[PDB]
Design a protein around this ligand. Sequence first.
Ligand SMILES: CO[C@@H]1O[C@H](CNc2nc3cc4c(=O)[nH]c(N)nc4cc3[nH]2)[C@H]2OC(C)(C)O[C@@H]12
Ligand SMILES: CO[C@@H]1O[C@H](CNc2nc3cc4c(=O)[nH]c(N)nc4cc3[nH]2)[C@H]2OC(C)(C)O[C@@H]12
Ligand SMILES: [Cl-]
Ligand SMILES: [Cl-]
Ligand SMILES: [Zn+2]
Ligand SMILES: [Zn+2]
Lengths: 370, 370
Amino acid sequence: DRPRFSFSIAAREGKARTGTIEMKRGVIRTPAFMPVGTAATVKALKPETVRATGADIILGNTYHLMLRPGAERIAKLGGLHSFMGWDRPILTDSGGYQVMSLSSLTKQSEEGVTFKSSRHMLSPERSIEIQHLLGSDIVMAFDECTPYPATPSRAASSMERSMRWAKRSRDAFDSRKEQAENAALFGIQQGSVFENLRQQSADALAEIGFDGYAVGGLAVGEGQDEMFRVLDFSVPMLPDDKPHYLMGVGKPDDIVGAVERGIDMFDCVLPTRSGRNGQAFTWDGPINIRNARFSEDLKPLDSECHCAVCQKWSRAYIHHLIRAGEILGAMLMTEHNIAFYQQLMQKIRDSISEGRFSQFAQDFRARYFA
Amino acid sequence: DRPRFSFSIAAREGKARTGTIEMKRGVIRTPAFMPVGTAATVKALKPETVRATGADIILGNTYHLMLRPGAERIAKLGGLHSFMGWDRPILTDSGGYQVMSLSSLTKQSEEGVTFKSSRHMLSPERSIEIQHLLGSDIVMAFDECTPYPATPSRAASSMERSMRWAKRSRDAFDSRKEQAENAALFGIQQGSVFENLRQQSADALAEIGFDGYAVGGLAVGEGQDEMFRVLDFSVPMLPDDKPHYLMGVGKPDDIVGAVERGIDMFDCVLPTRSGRNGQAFTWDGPINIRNARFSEDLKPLDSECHCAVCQKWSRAYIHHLIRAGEILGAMLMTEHNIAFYQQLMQKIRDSISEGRFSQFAQDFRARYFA
Ligand SMILES: CO[C@@H]1O[C@H](CNc2nc3cc4c(=O)[nH]c(N)nc4cc3[nH]2)[C@H]2OC(C)(C)O[C@@H]12
Ligand SMILES: CO[C@@H]1O[C@H](CNc2nc3cc4c(=O)[nH]c(N)nc4cc3[nH]2)[C@H]2OC(C)(C)O[C@@H]12
Ligand SMILES: [Cl-]
Ligand SMILES: [Cl-]
Ligand SMILES: [Zn+2]
Ligand SMILES: [Zn+2]
């Protein structure tokens, strides 16, 4: 049987790595893309369809599930896996992004954050407890995603609080024997765009010790050049032998460049949300299927994609569905986009395994941006 | 290979019949329920899911497809079957219901009906032509669904016009060799609730001659007792050896009673539309999954249903999805309701075949209304 957690690196090229995370509920191939399932559903897809696209793990969210349907309720019903019908690993974010994005609803203190719609509290202890009640496989420490831009002083204060909360998260997780024995805990690096703060954060997290390390505080409006600059110095600060998770990233070219910088795991709403809005990803760049130029286009969304949508339906049909507001349009766009993302990850994994990832990245960019 | 059209009756009990319609694109088991796919999609279902529930044929609509995406456009793209990915029979309504339901947008004459949003015209000739461009397998005559209630004079005038339009529909269909050789044409009986007008309409349609006969002008607000009273005298007026199609019906108990009165084919938006609104059909009657009493109910939607939804997900999960407005909620409710309708039709067919349909109808009603 599989261990609680084992990360193995099978091949490397520069800073890029490919390998596997073995957990009780399944194996995760890395670099990995996690479809987002915030409301206990990957929007518009059955779990079997999510799996058919190639996903090994999905993301849930402590904050949203705490509000609806409720964490204690999900536990009473048998846990999130049973509830939604996904039996493979689930990573749950801790609520630390909503500490920032919904800050106007919040009162923040050293103890935690109270959200006001009804009031709901989050803290390191309560976040870890909720993730236990959900039955999460990868538990995220409770942090604050520092707003961007941030002054050095405020970035430091925020990061320091997050590191104190990381230790509280570690202790809460370890004090719950069933959780400690069956789940994994990842810490989240903060420090905004500042190298010295990123180093202090990495050092604090490594001293505490985690099963994996997320780069937090990015995909907050900084743009790709700046994100890549921060990754250039931040990822090498993390323990090499544990997974590196870039939260909330991103577009296909963001993912490729982040893998080139040592990232192993990703999640993003882009394929699902923008799919419902009519944006389809292709190897020649994104297209907006609503555009009148697709009304009589019999080609599939993408000329090479192996997904079930591209095997059966035309751009013209999907154009009609999205223009009409039909649910099947959301379903088909979403399945294709998630399948495209998984095929991207597979090409990344294969190219690293074969020592040709740098060439893949160059070929990918030349065609995607042509 | 299958014929253009052959209806065979394999077994009978009272006025009820069970059998098959063989067409080039497939066999239709009768009594049959046709899921509605007005916008070239059965809402929230892939065609493979529609088929997996047991459907042999689906319904499309001349009026809606004429407007969006356009009939000529669908023909240029290869026809409705290819466009939407359903390769089995499709019956298309002619637009005659919209002649009534959208009458405020219309100018009506003996020639046809002009609809004003852009203006679009329908006539016997244009309706049959559109159904040809779509590649419909069962073409409906262009009629008027008489409003309810109607005075005897107005019901007679409307029915008489519909019979003139039925002859024009027949001639238009026959004058298009590819359509006449590969599709079937059904006539539509009118006459409101009046026995003498229903008889005149049946006589006119039988004199023209059609492959099947619909009972039009019902499911227009008259209620079940009155609908059944009209069916009692109207269905025996139609040729016994051709299918009898009750347009727009209906709730499960409407279907059972209509089969008891000699109906072979049905279509209704109830399972799809009310499913999206949270109503699930069960053998113990409908339930509204939004109700708080389902928030922690781990049972499936229905305790006996064989559908994939009832094999995997709980009422509690589907309650959460529908309350949250999640697309997967619409998908799961719709699949279950269509599967329930198909299981109803299968039980009807089997019970007629075994000479126990009267007992089935009594047992069904006793439990459904308990
Ligand atoms: C849904 O928003 C869009 O998708 C990206 C999300 N960006 C992002 N950053 C994150 C950072 C953290 C963090 O520091 N801590 C914790 N606990 N969770 C995090 C989660 C994060 N999700 C954004 O990218 C754009 C700007 C394109 O749209 C946004
Ligand atoms: C979507 O409305 C609901 O579903 C039922 C539809 N009823 C109905 N009757 C029809 C009659 C004709 C006809 O005479 N000619 C032609 N060409 N097509 C027809 C189509 C018909 N569809 C209604 O039933 C209720 C009232 C429950 O809601 C309505
Ligand atoms: Cl999303
Ligand atoms: Cl519907
Ligand atoms: Zn595809
Ligand atoms: Zn079911």
